[PDB]
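Objective 1.3, modelling of assemblies. Example input:
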Amino acid sequence: LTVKSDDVNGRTKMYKNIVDGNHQMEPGMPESFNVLLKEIRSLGINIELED
Amino acid sequence: LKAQTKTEEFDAIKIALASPDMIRSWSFGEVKKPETINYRTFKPERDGLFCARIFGPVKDYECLCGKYKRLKHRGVICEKCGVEVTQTKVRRERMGHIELASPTAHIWFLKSLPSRIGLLLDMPLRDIERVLYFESYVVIEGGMTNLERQQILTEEQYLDALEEFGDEFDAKMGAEAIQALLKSMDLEQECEQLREELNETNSETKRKKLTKRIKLLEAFVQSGNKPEWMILTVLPVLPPDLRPLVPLDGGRFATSDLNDLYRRVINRNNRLKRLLDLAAPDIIVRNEKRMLQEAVDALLDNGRRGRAITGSNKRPLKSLADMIKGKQGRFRQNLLGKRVDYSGRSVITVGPYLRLHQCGLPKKMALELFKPFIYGKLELRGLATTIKAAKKMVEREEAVVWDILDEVIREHPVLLNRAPTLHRLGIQAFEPVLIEGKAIQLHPLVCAAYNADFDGDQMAVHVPLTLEAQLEARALMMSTNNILSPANGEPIIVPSQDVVLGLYYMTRDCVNAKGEGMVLTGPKEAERLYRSGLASLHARVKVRITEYEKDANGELVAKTSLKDTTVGRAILWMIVPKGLPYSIVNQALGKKAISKMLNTCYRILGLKPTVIFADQIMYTGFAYAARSGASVGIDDMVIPEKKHEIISEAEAEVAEIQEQFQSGLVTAGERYNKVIDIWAAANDRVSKAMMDNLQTETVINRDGQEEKQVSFNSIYMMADSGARGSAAQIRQLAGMRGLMAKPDGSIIETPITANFREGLNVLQYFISTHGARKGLADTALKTANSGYLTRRLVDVAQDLVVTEDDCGTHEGIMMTPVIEGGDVKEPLRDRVLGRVTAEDVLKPGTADILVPRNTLLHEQWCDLLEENSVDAVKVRSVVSCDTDFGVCAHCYGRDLARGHIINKGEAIGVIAAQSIGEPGTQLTSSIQVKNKGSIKLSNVKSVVNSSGKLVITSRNTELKLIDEFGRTKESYKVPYGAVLAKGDGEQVAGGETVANWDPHTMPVITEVSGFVRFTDMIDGQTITRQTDELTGLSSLVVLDSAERTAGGKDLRPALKIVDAQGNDVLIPGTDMPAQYFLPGKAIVQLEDGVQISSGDTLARIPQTGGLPRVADLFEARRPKEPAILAEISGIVSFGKETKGKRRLVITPVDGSDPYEEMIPKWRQLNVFEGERVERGDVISDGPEAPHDILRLRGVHAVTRYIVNEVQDVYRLQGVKINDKHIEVIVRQMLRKATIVNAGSSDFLEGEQVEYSRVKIANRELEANGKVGATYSRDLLGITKASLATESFISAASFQETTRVLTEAAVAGKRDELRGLKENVIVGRLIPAGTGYAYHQDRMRRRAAG
Amino acid sequence: ARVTVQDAVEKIGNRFDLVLVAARRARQMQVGGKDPLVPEENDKTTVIALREIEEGLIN
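Predicted structure (C-alpha cells):
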C-alpha cells in the first residue's frame, strides 16, 4: 500500500522491473508525502533529513 | 559487520526548523511570472511555473530552447537560459524559490485553540490578534517606558506616543514587529524567572502555565529551533511535474487549479517587493502582508477564515488540506486506497482432495494474474519472439505459454484472504494447483479457521511477488505451521464432523461382528479385509501392533503388543505414524478426542508427523465416511409412550394446580413458577426416557439371543462423536423443547407442549420466533462494533515491541487459581502456560527449589507444576518488566502460533490488540456442598457459643474445602453472622449445611458473655418501644439519628456490655471498651439485664458482564456508586448527620491522621467503627474504582484483579486466552503518571513513566544524588491514550491532522521514524521483524559510526 | 517431501531473519553469480536457500 499500487511511478518502475524478473527495490516516500514536506516548507518549519 | 563506506540506504527521520538557506540548497531558479501560457500561443512560459531555465527537460535529456535533443546530452545547459539536459523524471524533483519581502506570519498557529503564539510570547491571544490584523501597534524592544513588552496601542494613541516619546521607544504593528520580539525572546532569562514563579506563585491558574511554558521553552533548547524562523522570507516552489497542467480539449482548463492559486501568490509576491522599490505607505504594504497571507491560506485550507470563493463562482479556492486530511491522514492509508493487483476476488468451493499445503486456482484467473511473469520468462529464456507477440500468443491462447504458466506457478506459493476477516488467522498461505474452473478451491478443514462456511465467501487470493514474501508465505503464513492459536496453545483446527463420523465408524464397536475373533499381523491385510468386503470394520480382531515410542534420544523404541481391537482401528494404524502409540487410537474417536489426539502427536513426536498425519486423516476421514453407509433413520426417531404419559400427568397436574388457584392456596405468581416447576420435572423425566431409549435399544444377536451395544441410531452417533448433535438439540427434535424466553426477555411459565418433529401451532411458534430473531439481531450488530473495538485497541498498543530478551529483575506478579464459588473457575496451569517463573520457587518443602528463577515453563514444566503441591506461583509479568519502551522475551514467554522464545522484532503491541478484540464479536438460602472435604476457616474470628456451636463475627469470610486429598476445592463467601457446624479442622460430608444464615436478616452478635445494659439510650429520643400487640418479646429498637429530636441528633446510642456485677468489659483480643454504637432500623431482642452468650443473635436488621462491561474496564469509566476504598489502616469513628452528608472520621494508627471521608448516609455504609479497617477494605458497596485499586492497593494488584474479572467474561464465552496480551494493555493504560515530587520537571505532570524511568536512572547516578521528580501511577482510558499520541505520523492519521499540524510543528518534534505506523506511510522496513537487522545496520549508521 | 519448515525455524530462530538470509542467497542464484550446489528439483531459489539452511552450510 505504498511502493505497490500507491506510487503511480513506483509500480510502473516495478512493471518495467518485473517484466525482466528481479525483485530488488528502494524505500518509498509516496511523492505526495514530499508535498507534505513542501507545504510546511511553505510555512516555515522546514523538515530535513540530516546525515 | 562494519558501517558500510558506500551509500546503500539512508537513515532515521526527523522534523524541526531549518533554514531558507536550505531552500536555497534546492534552488534551481526563481519563478517570476505567474503566467504559464502566452495568451497567444499556448506555449509554456519561461520564467514561470513551467520555465526551462529554472526547471527544464520535458523530453528525456532535453534542452527546451531546442538545441540539444539527443540523449547524448547530460548536464550541458542552454547558456542563454540554463536548461540542464536531464531527466523529465528529475523534473518531479525540481524545487525553486521566489524572494519574498512580505513577512509571512503564522495565522494558523494563532487562531489555533492550542494558542501556539499565545503562550509562546506570554501575551494574551486576543491582543495578539489585534496586532496581526494590523489595527494595533504592539510595543517591541520596550520595557521601562510607560508601556511594557506585552501591550498594544491604538493608532492615534501611538501618534500621541510620538509626541510623548520621540526617543528611547518603538512600537510597530504586526508580524514585522513580532519578528523583532522573536529576535529578542531570551529563553533562559525567562527560564530563571519561570522557576522563580515556580517558587513564588502557588496557584494552578499561574503555575500550570508555568510547567508547560518552561517545558516548551527548553523544548526549543531540546531542538535548537529559534522562533525567528516563524517569519517566512523565501518561498519554496513545488516541482512542475507535481501540479499537473492539462487544459480541457476545446479551450478550457482541466488543470489542477493549484496553479491558478500559486498564480495569485506570485502576483502578490512581486507586488510587495515593488512596494519596497517605490516605498509605499506602511498601512498598505502591511495590507499586502495580509494579502500574501491569504494566498498562503487559500493554498492550505483556505486557512480557517472562511473559504473565499473563486472567480465569480460558487466554489471555494482549492484545498491541499483536503489533500492532507481526508481519512486516516492521506488516501492510500484511507479506506479505498489502492485495490490489490496480482490477486483475485473469487467465490469458493471444497475440493476434498487438496493436500494440506495447497489451494486451487482457476486457469482463466491464472493467465490474467501472471502475464508479466509470463513475459519475464518468455524473454529471459527467449521462447517468444517479442513481448508483443507474447501478448498475441495468449491472444491465441497458445499451448506454449500455458507451459510457461506452469513455470510461474508450480512452486510459486500464494497468500489467501477474505473480506469479513478481522483476525490474523484469516490470512494464510498455500501452494497453487491448476484447476480448470472459476472457483478457488481449498483444504476443507481450514475453512473453520477463516470461519468461512459456504454462504458466499469471496476470497481475494494474493500473490507474493518478491522473494521475501514468497518465503514469508511458506514460513509463518504457511497453513501447516500456524496449527496453533496465538490465543491458546491448542491445535486451531479440530476435525469438523463429516471426517469424524467416518472415523467414528472406523474405531467402532457393534455387537454383531463378521470376523469377530480372528487375528492379523498387519494393518495392511486389514485393508485387504474390509476394502474388499469379506469382513466388517467393527469385528473384534486380535492384531499384533508393533508400536513405537521415541523414548530414546530421538529413536522410536520397538515394543511388540497385541490388542483386542476393531478392524477400523487396525486400518487406523496405517494412518497413525509409528511414533504415536496405539493406545490413544484404541478409542471410539470423538470430536474432542481427535482434538487432543493431534495435539499429543505434536508435543510428543513433532510437527511434521502431525501435519502429514492430519493430511492422511482428512482423506480417510471422508473416505470411510462414504464407506459408512448408515446415515439417517426415521425408525430411530421413536417417541416413547412415556412422553405422552407424562404430558397426560403434566395436564392433570396443572389442571389441579389451577384448581388450587380457584381455591386460593397458591398465588398466580407462586403458581407461575410452579407451572415452571413441574413441567421442568416432567421434561427431565421424558428426557430420562428418550435418552436411555437412544442409548441401549440397539440389541442385536451375538452368542445368545440378543445383546446390547450403544445405539447404532445415527442421531446418537452425532451425540457420541459430539460432532453436531448435543443432548439439548436432541431434546428439541424428539422431545419437548422446554421453556422459552418471552418477547420481554423473561420466561413464559408454559413450555412448547409437544415436539417439532411432530406438531405444534403458530402461538407456540410466536414464542419460539422471539428466540430465533434474537440470535439474528445479535450477529447483525456485534460484528461492526468488534472492528471498532479493535480500532481503539490498535489505537493504544501498535508501537509496543519486544526489544530485549532478559532484563535484570526478579519482580513479577502472582498467578493463582481463581477458586470461586465451587471448584476453581480458572486453574493455575493455564495462566502459567507460556511464561517464566519470577524467582527460584520452592516446594511445600521449604528451601527446595522446584523451578530455578529463569526457566521457560512449557508443556512439561506445566505438567511439572501440576504434580507438585505448589498452588501459588509468582511469575514474571509483562508490566513488571524492567525493559523500558518494550518487554523482554522472558516477561512475555513463548505462546503464540509458535511455542518458542518471543523475538526481538516481534511487535506484541498489535497482536495483543487483535487477539483481545477477536472474541469481540462473541461477547454479549444455606451453603451445602455436594463434595467431600473439610472446613478451613480463613481470616475470621469464630467463637463458640451455647450448645457448643460456632458463629462468624465478620463479613470477610472464605470457606475452604481442604479435601482428604489436600487441594482447596470449594470456596464460599459467607455473610455477616452465621451458624457454623465445623471449626478449623473438621471434615465435611456430602450434602451438609456448614454455614446457615438468614438472607433477610443481618444479626449483630456479641463475642463475650454478660449482661446488657442500655446506656445513653432513652425511649423516645434514641430508641423506641416496639412491643406490638402481635409480639410478646420485650425489645428496644434503635432508630436512626435523623428522626430524633434537637438535643437528640447529637448522639450515637451506646450498648454497654457489662459483666456479672455491672462494669464495662474489656474485649479478649482487642483493648476496646464495650460500647456498641448501633445503626438505624436494628430490631433488638432483649430487655434490661439479659445475659447474652458468646456468639448470640442480639438484634435483627431486615434487608452487564459482557462486551459493554469490558468496554467500561478499558475506557476507565468511573461507576455510579463506587465501593469507597479505605485509604489507611486505622480505627474509625463517625460524625455529622443530615445536612448533605454523613462524615466518616478515620483515625490512622501509625500514619497521617487527617484521613477522613465525607460519605452520603444516602449511600449504604457497612463500616464497623469497632473494627480497624485496612488500606484495601471496602467501606460501602457496589462496583469499585480500579483507579484507587491501582494506587491504594497496588499496580500489580489491580493488573491481576481486572485480568481475573475480564477473563471471567471469557468464561461466559468459554474461550481461553492467555493474559499476557491483556496485561500489556494494562501496562499501556499506566504508561503516564502524575508526578508527586517537584524538583526536576513538575509537581503534577501527567508524564510518560518510562521517560521518567531513565530520568531517575541517571539521577541516582550521574550529576545528582536525588533531585529528580518521582511519580505516582496514573491510569487512563484507551480513547484518551489514543488522544495522547506523541509522534505526529500516527497522530495525523486518526486525530485531526490540522490539530497534529500545530501539535508537533511548533515543537519540531524530531521522531526518527521509530514506530511501525510511521515506517509504513514512508514505505520502509520497520526496525522490527525482517527489518530488524535491516534497521540494525541503519540505527548504528544513524548518529553513530 | 516438503510441507513444513519446522526445520528452518530451528536454525535461524527469529522467523524473519530467515526471510532475510535465504532471500539474498536466492538472488545470487538468480543472477548467474553462482549456481545451486545442493541439488534442486524445480524449486524456486527461495526454497533452495532453505535447503542450504537444513544442510547447514549456509545461514
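Chain B has 41 helices and 50 strands.
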